Amino acid sequence: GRVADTVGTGPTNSEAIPALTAAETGHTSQVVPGDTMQTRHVKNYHSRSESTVENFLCRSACVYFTEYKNSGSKRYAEWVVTTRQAAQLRRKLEFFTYIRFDLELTFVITSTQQPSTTQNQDAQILTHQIMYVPPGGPVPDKVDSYVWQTSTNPSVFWTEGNAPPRMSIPFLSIGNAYSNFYDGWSDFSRDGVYGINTLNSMGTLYARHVNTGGTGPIKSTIRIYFKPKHVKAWIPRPPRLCQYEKAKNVNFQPSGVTTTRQSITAMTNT
């Protein structure tokens, strides 16, 4: 894991020309300082461990959050699982064309009492259900549906005040890797929406209150955190320059290649 040492070199007068090459060939020069100047010998101990692909990707990030109430219209939350709605993790993943990983999911669930006129509020403690529906499974259309029975769908039940709930998911693709980019169509006539496949289909998450607590209104928020683990990745790419616009495509607004300075010899930015 260590970085390379510096070989000490003395003066030189010869036909060897390490510093002259031809960039046309597609080759990157392997020159070191000793090729073009006198250097001392250095015993370098610095390490490259913090820039492995795993260490670069393996931190928790919030990919999405939403809300649901204990009364009224929106009694449960519903989210198609994806990495493309939050900028910071999407950008890190799109350094690579193809990638395999497992996931650690952590949920941060919090609640807030809402303004009301109801007197004598003595709410009991709230439990929450989170259900994961794989693609193709039937989905709940109301907070009191037989679907929440979860005979075969994994569900986590969690009571407020305890540690946040967490579970692992294996690499889940029908392909040999997830594809971050797809230059093509799903329909053989190419008259459809471009860039859409189902190699990244992961399913849907539903969240509800199991009990209502008390007589007052209460709104909860669920934040979903993805941490990739056991990562393998292929075919590095230029990082995303333009700001993201849509979750389902790469559409952008054009922008300059960097920011400006005053003149070609100016030593500061503008």
Add this chain to the structure above:
Amino acid sequence: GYSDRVRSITLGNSTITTQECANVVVGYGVWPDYLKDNEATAEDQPTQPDVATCRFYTLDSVQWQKTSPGWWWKLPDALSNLGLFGQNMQYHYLGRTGYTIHVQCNASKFHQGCLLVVCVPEAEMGCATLDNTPSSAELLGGDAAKEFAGEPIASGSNKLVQRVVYNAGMGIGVGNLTIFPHQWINLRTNNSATIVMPYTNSVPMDNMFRHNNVTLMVIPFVPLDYCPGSTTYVPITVTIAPMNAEYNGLRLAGHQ
């Protein structure tokens, strides 16, 4: 004697020569080859045509003008109407191939200019209209080159490609395109570029009409210039040979 500037490349009944070349770039160090038993999923016996399809096809030429932004070609599709490679694309569900790409542009010792030649895996492009995605006719040149633009494509309610060259149609910085396999054609050094590209995909085989998995791009970074009295018409010419081609799933012809 010997010189490392000369090169000959023979495939099938075709051969290409060059007297001012740089080197040959090989993919990601990987030479193309047929799919092996322990990575296959499709069970039928594949056809391997082997000289009828693994040979050089020369596309239509293109003019380098002093203001040209650049060109691109999606690779399976560029050859899709062309010979028995095209016929085998039309009759099979599944296909697998690598490529030898060769880009040619000569000019005198008095002309100057510099082109980047890159082979981009999975070049998913953006639409000018942020809600839409671009139509097939905008993305697929089909044996004719597609052109980049010099200024941003105006937004409407259209299906045009956002074509501006300095974002490479992809929302990135164009100077960072050297992470991909590539060469430079620099008119004072070099009149040819050659890239050998292996098969790349997240699956072992794929449909060749539905998905274009690599894209050749040719982009002038230093514009063409010359002085009056010099020849003004300087074309660029692309020749492409599929390598180790295989096909699975024979049925009636078509793509729908």
Add this chain to the structure above:
Amino acid sequence: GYSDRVRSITLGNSTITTQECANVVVGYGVWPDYLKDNEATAEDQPTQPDVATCRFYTLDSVQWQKTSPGWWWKLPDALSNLGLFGQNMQYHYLGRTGYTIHVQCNASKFHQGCLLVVCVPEAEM
């Protein structure tokens, strides 16, 4: 057990079965094979497509009427518009092939009739 009336023939992605057959006639005792080095004259490397073209093609059916005189088919030409065999015919100066021919006609134990099935080299008419 076993019966010499049943037969299966598989080629490429196709297979044919039959339960009332006679035997199989092989040419003039000679099974088909690729051309060898010491009999070749064309110097270029040949293409051998091998399942894309070596497989069963079924032609349009024909009605046997009580007064039918008979039918004929010239062989390269009968398949000339048909699949990748047709495409390879269209793109090449030269070709070489053998054939497996299979003619089918069923009827009840109460019908009667008799057909000759022949393969004629060089049928100049």
Add this chain to the structure above:
Amino acid sequence: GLPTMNTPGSCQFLTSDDFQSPSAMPQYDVTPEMRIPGEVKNLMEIAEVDSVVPVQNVGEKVNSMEAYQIPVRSNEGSGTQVFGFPLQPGYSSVFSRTLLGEILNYYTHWSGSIKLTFMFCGSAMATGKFLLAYSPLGAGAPTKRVDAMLGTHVVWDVGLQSSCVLCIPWISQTHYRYVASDECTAGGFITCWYQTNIVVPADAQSSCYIMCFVSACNDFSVRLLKDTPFISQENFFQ
């Protein structure tokens, strides 16, 4: 006390957890096991058993035995179509209620080859020949016999051996396909055509029926358990 630290996940109830737990009935002595015939170790053992396909699932025919019957007859021509349906073993209404289909609807992914057995059920005096064909996707379903013939197929000659097997091999760009309907993982088409006619003597019926059966090959498997869309409930039963 041994110094410890609770991690996230502490005190959750995850329905697919696998933990030990104290028994409510200490030292209870279970009834000894008996040797019962037909022990099942794996659901695929069920999937590999043939079951009858409801091919003629048209209108009111699903409320009778006619859904399982495929009509054939003596024609005044040849090469017309007998049936066609898509290779969607969990999602096509042709396949969804077979043994194979009912097992598939508890899973998200499927892979492997499939067998279709046909049994001719006319009289012994009837003869005929049929073309059974599978056409991989990308070009649509064939509409004539001369287009169906280009794909993978069997020519079935009806005789003393009454049944014929069409094997639908796994030909896919992916290692797995979805159980739900999905165009990126389209399966292709299955069709059947008259190769010659049905021919009978006088005093035998000129109309006849074929029956179709489906099962899985020894290369078949399923992934990612889920709830079936077939069973449902509005209240607890009584």
Add this chain to the structure above:
Amino acid sequence: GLPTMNTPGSCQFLTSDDFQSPSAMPQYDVTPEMRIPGEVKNLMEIAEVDSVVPVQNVGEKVNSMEAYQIPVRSNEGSGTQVFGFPLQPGYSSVFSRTLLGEILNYYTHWSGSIKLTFMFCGSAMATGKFLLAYSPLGAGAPTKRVDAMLGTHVVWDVGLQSSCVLCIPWISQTHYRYVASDECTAGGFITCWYQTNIVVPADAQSSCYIMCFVSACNDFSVRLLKDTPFISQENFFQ
């Protein structure tokens, strides 16, 4: 029960934690791995690849290809300046959007040597010689060629080999420097000067362009992961 005692930290969720956890999908069988070209093990493998520098990033030139072009021409003198910028590989707008720069902006500390490759892109009939110079900090940037010559430098002679490499060696009082702008860890200056003129025959263009490339040497490394200032968001995308 084994007697235990919970320590501080119990039941917290720390985003860079590394703990085991129960899988929601017991015994699921992952798709087998494929040999795909271009596997990446370490982000430094990307940093060591050359990419094109936007040196002429002045005004509207950042909205065209001219940002990557360095003008040179035949002069009526010698020794004038061609370009100059500071060694701030993560923070200078010259460097911030290169491959090297984009990786650096995810880190807090950087160390090691850097390579600048220049490619002359005039006609074959043009000749010239250039001085490429690095001046360590402490005295400001050089303003004449005779002051730039005192520091570390290369004299590039243009010919059949079209490209020349200036190595910027690690010369620092600290083992590491900050990615952000900071005077205690100032990096120094990079400048380029006409050593002789550009000389052409008649009927060849007297104006020409150079291009610059940056990459990391085999002694280079980065420390302390952080969030990049380049990507941002006001709502969840749709």
Add this chain to the structure above:
Amino acid sequence: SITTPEEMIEKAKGETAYLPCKFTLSPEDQGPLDIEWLISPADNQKVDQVIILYSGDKIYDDYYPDLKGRVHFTSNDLKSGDASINVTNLQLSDIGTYQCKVKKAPGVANKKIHLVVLVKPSGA
């Protein structure tokens, strides 16, 4: 989602506009299908008014007195992925923005069509 969610269509008075709304389902989308078409007229300040609905296996017309009998679905089989509509006998007072809303939980998609009707039949 719907194929081309933003577009504009120009026709002449007396002709009959085709408003395409073609959609594709994801494997996650397993709820019941709902299809709504609403309108925001250019001349008028009324906004977001249903003109034709499809739900629970059947169609519902008769929501906009103005388009009475002149708004229909074009497909014999709507749930296969076609929610396009025909408007007939076009006149200036209907120039506006039509909206197609397709629902099948979890999935939801919409499409905006800006219909311009011109006096003379001419694309200039």
Add this chain to the structure above:
Amino acid sequence: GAQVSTQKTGAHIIHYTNINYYKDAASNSATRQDFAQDPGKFTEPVKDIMIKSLPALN
């Protein structure tokens, strides 16, 4: 079945213990100590080796 491995330390060795508790590999902790590198597929992807002290083109 415990595994002992080395911790990350400074330069101028100390060990830690692990035991897997669950039945699937996807339940294990991250793989943070894989320090192999191979940049020669991205740098230097040329058919003919290029010796640094020689001219690139001759």
Add this chain to the structure above:
Amino acid sequence: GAQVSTQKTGAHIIHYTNINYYKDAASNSATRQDFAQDPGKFTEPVKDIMIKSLPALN
């Protein structure tokens, strides 16, 4: 008295530890790694073996 066993992993091995804590077998964790199969009692329950390449009835 710990038992070490193999985890479920992918193809192109890693182990886990268990110790029973309770006095009844019904307290143990599930039996998820029993991969034996025997379909020949449901397929092919015939008295006379049927060789696949021969006619079924003769």
